[PDB]
Amino acid sequence: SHHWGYGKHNGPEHWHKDFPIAKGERQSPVDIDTHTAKYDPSLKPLSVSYDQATSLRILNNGHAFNVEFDDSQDKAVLKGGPLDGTYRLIQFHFHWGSLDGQGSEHTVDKKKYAAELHLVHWNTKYGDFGKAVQQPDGLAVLGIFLKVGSAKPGLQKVVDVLDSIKTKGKSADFTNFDPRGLLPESLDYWTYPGSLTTPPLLECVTWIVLKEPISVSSEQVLKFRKLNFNGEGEPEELMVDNWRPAQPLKNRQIKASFK
Ligand SMILES: NS(=O)(=O)c1ccc(OC[C@@H](O)C[Te]C[C@@H](O)COc2ccc(S(N)(=O)=O)cc2)cc1
Ligand SMILES: [Zn+2]
């Protein structure tokens, strides 16, 4: 059974023993060297179309919390940019730190942000998420950095439900949540081919990482850090530092949408 996590004994340094692709050619996250990334004029405009998004539920899966969406139709899709065709939103989640100086998976010139939001989408040409993760162009993950400063009003509904999903396996109704309230003003981005950042580490992701971070309050991120990795009735282990460090870039080019 799966026993990977983020501890000294089951963390990122151990994952390769059960998931050998951990040492593969297109692993994520990476450090984004802003001076080596090249502006690509061939990139088409990015289209985030979340007007008809239908959120369903929020789940503590023991690694993060996921806000799940209805992906049975083209209700909330990502198109354009580096992408061919239509990618449907299935879930979002975050990665965060024990302190504000760490938490993000991607880094920018080695800078770590307090957290990183992942909006996960699958390519509709493969029919379902499970088929899409088997394909090199199966997923598109929109990554958004979080810095600590002013509160993000569009995050507060998420923060306020977390005490109902404290432990692994707990879920709560989470209808009528608008993920557009989690975006920054600018859609300027970097893109590169990579992987899932947790086991099974499948090399199926087109990464689109926004340049502009969102600001969240210290009080908002403190509520993320009150979650637990453990199940109810197990010793309490705070859900903090659920991020994989930067992996080798190898033979990849990061492309910028902006000058
Ligand atoms: N035979 S094989 O092709 O090698 C193969 C091996 C394992 C397979 O397991 C498929 C299952 O879907 C488990 Te992949 C869904 C799981 O919910 C994780 O999803 C994530 C979503 C986003 C991110 S992130 N942080 O990068 O945004 C991270 C994880 C399927 C095929
Ligand atoms: Zn993630």
UniProtKB/Swiss-Prot annotation:
Enzyme type, top EC level: lyase
Family matches, as CDD domains: alpha_CA_I_II_III_XIII (cd03119)
Catalytic reaction(s) noted: hydrogencarbonate + H(+) = CO2 + H2O; urea = cyanamide + H2O
GO molecular function: arylesterase activity; carbonate dehydratase activity; cyanamide hydratase activity; zinc ion binding
Cofactor annotation: Zn(2+); Co(2+)
Effect upon mutating residue 4 to A: Impaired activity, not rescued by 4-methylimidazole (4-MI)
Lyase is among the record's keywords: yes
Binding, Zn(2+): 93, 95, 118
Cofactor details (free text): Zinc. Can also use cobalt(II) with lower efficiency, but not copper(II), nickel(II) and manganese(II).
Site location (Involved in the binding of some activators, including histamine and L-histidine): 91
Key words, A-Z: Acetylation, Cell membrane, Cytoplasm, Disease variant, Lyase, Membrane, Metal-binding, Osteopetrosis, Phosphoprotein, Zinc
Effect of residue 66 to Q: 2-fold decrease in enzyme efficiency, as determined by kcat/KM ratio, and efficiently inhibited by chlorzolamide
One annotated Gene Ontology cellular component of this protein: plasma membrane
Active site, per annotation: 63
Effect seen on changing residue 63 to W: Impaired activity, rescued by 4-methylimidazole (4-MI). Impaired activity, not rescued by 4-methylimidazole (4-MI)
Misc. remarks from the entry: Target of drugs used in treatments against glaucoma disorder and breast cancer.
Assembly mode: Interacts with SLC4A4. Interaction with SLC4A7 regulates SLC4A7 transporter activity. Interacts with SLC26A6 isoform 4 (via C-terminus cytoplasmic domain).
Function field: Catalyzes the reversible hydration of carbon dioxide. Can also hydrate cyanamide to urea. Stimulates the chloride-bicarbonate exchange activity of SLC26A6. Essential for bone resorption and osteoclast differentiation. Involved in the regulation of fluid secretion into the anterior chamber of the eye. Contributes to intracellular pH regulation in the duodenal upper villous epithelium during proton-coupled peptide absorption.
Disorder this protein is connected to according to its UniProt record: Osteopetrosis, autosomal recessive 3: A rare genetic disease characterized by abnormally dense bone, due to defective resorption of immature bone. Osteopetrosis occurs in two forms: a severe autosomal recessive form occurring in utero, infancy, or childhood, and a benign autosomal dominant form occurring in adolescence or adulthood. Recessive osteopetrosis commonly manifests in early infancy with macrocephaly, feeding difficulties, evolving blindness and deafness, bone marrow failure, severe anemia, and hepatosplenomegaly.
Protein's UniProt name: Carbonic anhydrase 2
Organism: Homo sapiens (Human)
Highest classification ranks of the organism: Eukaryota, Metazoa, Chordata, Craniata, Vertebrata
Originating gene: CA2
